[PDB]
């Protein structure tokens, strides 16, 4: 064998408001085995400087991991979540909804 | 079906020598360990290896070293021996570590002395004295008595013979030598031993008794410039013959 | 960190004994005791880990964690448990924090004394005369020499197996003129039943 | 005190991926990391800053040899697994051991392993035994059960030993651990009415809809509690809104003992 597809959750540190500088985080969890690939985009492209936490284990064996960047949201700007694990076939990417 | 095999037994070094004692264990444990005890305290942890491929040093690793060499083997170094080394080693396993119930399992010990100088070393005398008469008549047993005298250091091995066997019932040997001078700190030893026949076994005059004492002293390396003669590991003993 | 157990303790064959094990340490993964024949290797007895007494033939063992505090219990005595009992514990980090030991000391039990002190024939090899003190009751304390030139052994119990018969003895000996196996042992309280062959 | 829990886990990886590696461990306190070691380092490190400040050289090096003995075991463990699925390929193991303590005094204590994710064994500290999920599980029961020592030191170790680590490390981190930061809570339109939080610390919030002064549970989009990346945590709930009738809309949320409402006009 049971393997499960991560959640995946994008979205800011605080209420986003243009102009103001914030974190957009990308929250992926509920997933096994434990292999997986996490960037974050601009406008499609992808985002270099960006962190994330250790592998976190949760009680129900699955695990869960938080990517994050610093940024300024504006209007023009779209940003997205993209997650490759062997659960998917290709690529999924989740787009931050504000 | 070994368990842990630990070497060697006995070993006199001088001040500044080096020594390496021997562990095996044929278990298959993960965990090893090597002990010292000395009198009055409680077994003291040198170094142990937790799991094949890793070492740490215990309460007293200064002075020494280890290697596991391999899951089967841990070595424990003596570089340059000093006189507060001497003690009696013992290498141990167990088959984890990191969890409560996991029994120890011991080797043999090996009893090393570490000495300034040689010339205090010495091999023992020994001498058999045949059973009193008057025991004879009045209990029908005879006891005959080994002494090992003068010895140093305490690294001997007493055991009776009769008509060319071994034999320990009717043995008993001081559990602890006697230091002919107590209140030398590097006196010399004394140890008894009694084994106890019939009257009946002791008046066949074909039978035929001896002490022997394996005595653990130097080696062919060691240094020796005393006018007396060098005081090698060697076996004294001394005889008697059943009288009718 | 530290555990205490009593240095020695003596006991008569065919008896009970308990020995006590007190330790304070941080943290607790269980108690264990060990078996030291003197001249050899530990050997595991038991552990305890939870409150209350475990038994294993003769010997049982008893923990409680809120005293801080074990004992072994030994019944039915023989002269073979003769031996140091270690007490061990595994502390908050799994270090084993060994006690220092107690050596038990068994007496036997001397059916028939007939206590003795005997005149070993002389070795030819040797400038030693040799005294035995021998088949004493096990209440007897045999005391070292007060004389620098006599000698001295404490009491050994030898066990003749085929007569399934226990003895005490003590043996003395010196190269000294002075020396008589009537005066050899006079710094030991020995029975006043003791004998003494004519020389 | 509120309720704090102490929990470490294991994973091991049959065929892991070149780097990747093939042992992990980490220790929680509540939600926050506070050690970790794996098989690439090899060593037993902080994850929170007043577990450095307050654990000397001494634990790090200790059970850093713990831990490489525990990884050796954690091995040949799950190829013995692997071995009796007859199974190929790369597989997981994995263990979780921890203790809580609860808000009345009471404490909890469980053990227990997993194979590919799925609950393997199961430790009962109360009956002494191992519940087995199927039959190469119940192999393992059978020898685990045959060593009864090992049993009761694992009970004695979650009910006394963990609850004394808990209690040291709650101690250690008491300045993030036992604050309080209150939810910001806010309603908006999007037709669902969605109530939204964040802000606050500790994570454990309840956050619900009612209608006309009930609640719908059945009617309710629940969101999951989320790390905002500050040490604080968000979360949100909504409700669809009925275009036929008015109701009375109020989002309710309890957090750390204080409890809010925020009626929709
Ligand atoms: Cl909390
Ligand atoms: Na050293």
Redesign the pocket.
């Known amino acids: 064998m049971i393997q499960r597809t991560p959640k995946i959750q994008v979205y800011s540190r605080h209420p986003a408001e243009n102009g103001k500088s914030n974190f957009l985080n990308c929250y992926v969890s509920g997933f096994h085995p434990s292999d997986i690939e996490v960037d974050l985009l601009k406008n499609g492209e992808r985002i270099e400087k960006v962190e994330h936490s250790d592998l976190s284990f949760s009680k129900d064996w699955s695990f869960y991991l938080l990517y994050y960047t610093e940024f300024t949201p504006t209007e023009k700007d779209e940003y997205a979540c993209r997650v490759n694990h062997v659960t998917l076939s290709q690529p999924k990417i989740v787009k931050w909804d504000r | 079906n070994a368990g842990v095999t630990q070497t060697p037994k006995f070993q006199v070094l001088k001040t500044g020598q080096s020594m390496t004692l021997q562990c095996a264990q044929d278990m298959n444990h993960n965990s090893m360990y090597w002990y010292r005890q000395d009198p009055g305290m409680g077994l003291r942890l040198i170094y142990y290896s937790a799991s094949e491929g890793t070492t740490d ?1 215990g309460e007293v ?5 280890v290697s596991r060499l391999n899951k089967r083997e841990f070595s424990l170094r003596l570089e340059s021996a000093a006189p507060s080394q001497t003690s009696v080693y013992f290498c141990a396993s167990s088959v984890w570590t990191g969890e409560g119930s996991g029994e120890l399992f011991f080797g043999e010990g090996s009893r090393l002395t570490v000495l300034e100088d040689l010339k205090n070393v010495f091999p023992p005398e020994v001498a058999v004295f045949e059973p009193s008469e008057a025991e004879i008549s009045h209990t029908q047993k005879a006891t005959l008595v080994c002494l090992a005298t003068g010895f140093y250091p305490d690294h001997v091995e007493l055991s009776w013979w009769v008509n060319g066997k071994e034999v320990h019932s009717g043995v008993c040997t001081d559990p602890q030598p006697l230091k002919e001078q107590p209140a030398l700190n590097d006196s010399r030893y004394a140890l008894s031993s009694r084994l106890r026949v019939s009257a009946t076994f002791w008046q066949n005059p074909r039978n035929h008794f001896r002490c022997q004492v394996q005595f653990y002293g130097l080696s062919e390396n060691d240094e020796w410039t005393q006018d007396r003669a060098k005081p090698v590991t060697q076996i004294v003993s001394a005889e008697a013959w059943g009288r009718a | 960190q530290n555990i205490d157990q009593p240095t020695e303790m003596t006991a008569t064959e065919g008896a009970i004994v308990q020995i006590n094990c007190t330790y304070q340490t941080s943290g607790f993964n269980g108690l264990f005791w060990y078996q030291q024949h003197a001249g050899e290797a530990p050997t595991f007895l038991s552990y305890n880990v939870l409150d209350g007494l475990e038994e294993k033939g003769r010997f049982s063992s008893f923990l409680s964690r809120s005293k801080g505090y074990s004992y072994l219990l030994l019944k039915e005595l023989q002269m073979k448990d003769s031996a140091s009992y270690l007490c061990a514990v595994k502390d908050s980090n799994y270090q084993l924090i060994w006690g220092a030991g107690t050596k038990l000391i068994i007496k036997p039990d001397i059916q028939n004394p007939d206590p003795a002190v005997y005149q070993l024939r002389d070795s030819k090899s040797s400038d030693k005369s040799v005294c035995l003190f021998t088949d004493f009751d096990s209440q007897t304390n045999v005391s070292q020499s007060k004389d620098s030139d006599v000698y001295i052994t404490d009491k050994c119990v030898l066990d003749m197996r085929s007569m399934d018969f226990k003895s005490n003895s003590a043996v003395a000996w010196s190269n000294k003129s002075d020396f008589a196996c009537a005066n050899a042992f006079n710094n030991s309280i020995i029975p006043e039943d003791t004998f003494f062959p004519s020389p | 005190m509120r309720t704090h829990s102490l929990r470490y886990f294991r994973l091991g990886v049959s065929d892991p991926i070149h780097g990747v590696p093939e042992f992990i461990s980490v220790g929680y306190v509540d939600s926050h990391p506070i050690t970790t070691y794996d098989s690439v380092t090899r060593q037993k490190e902080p994850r929170a800053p007043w577990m450095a400040e307050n654990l000397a050289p001494d634990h790090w090096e200790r059970y850093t040899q713990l831990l490489r003995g525990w990884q050796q075991m954690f091995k040949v463990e799950l190829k013995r697994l692997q071995r009796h699925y007859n199974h190929s390929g790369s597989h997981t193991y994995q263990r979780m051991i921890g203790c809580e303590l609860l808000e009345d005094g009471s404490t909890t204590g469980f053990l227990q392993y997993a194979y590919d994710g799925q609950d393997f064994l199961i430790f009962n500290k109360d009956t002494l035994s191992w519940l087995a999920v199927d039959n190469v599980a119940h192999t393992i029961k059978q020898a685990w059960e045959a060593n009864q020592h090992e049993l009761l030191y694992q009970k004695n170790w979650l009910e006394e030993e963990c609850i004394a680590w808990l209690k040291r490390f709650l101690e250690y981190g008491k300045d993030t651990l036992q604050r309080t930061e209150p939810p910001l809570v806010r309603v908006n339109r999007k037709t669902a009415l969605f109530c939204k939080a964040h802000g606050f610390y500790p994570p454990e919030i309840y956050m619900t809809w009612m209608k006309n002064g009930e609640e719908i549970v059945q009617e309710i989009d629940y969101g999951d509690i989320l790390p905002s990346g500050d040490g604080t945590y968000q979360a949100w709930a909504s409700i669809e809104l009925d275009p036929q009738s008015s109701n009375l809309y109020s989002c309710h949320v309890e957090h750390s003992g204080v409890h809010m409402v925020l009626q929709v006009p």
């Open positions: 040093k690793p200064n002075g020494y070293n």
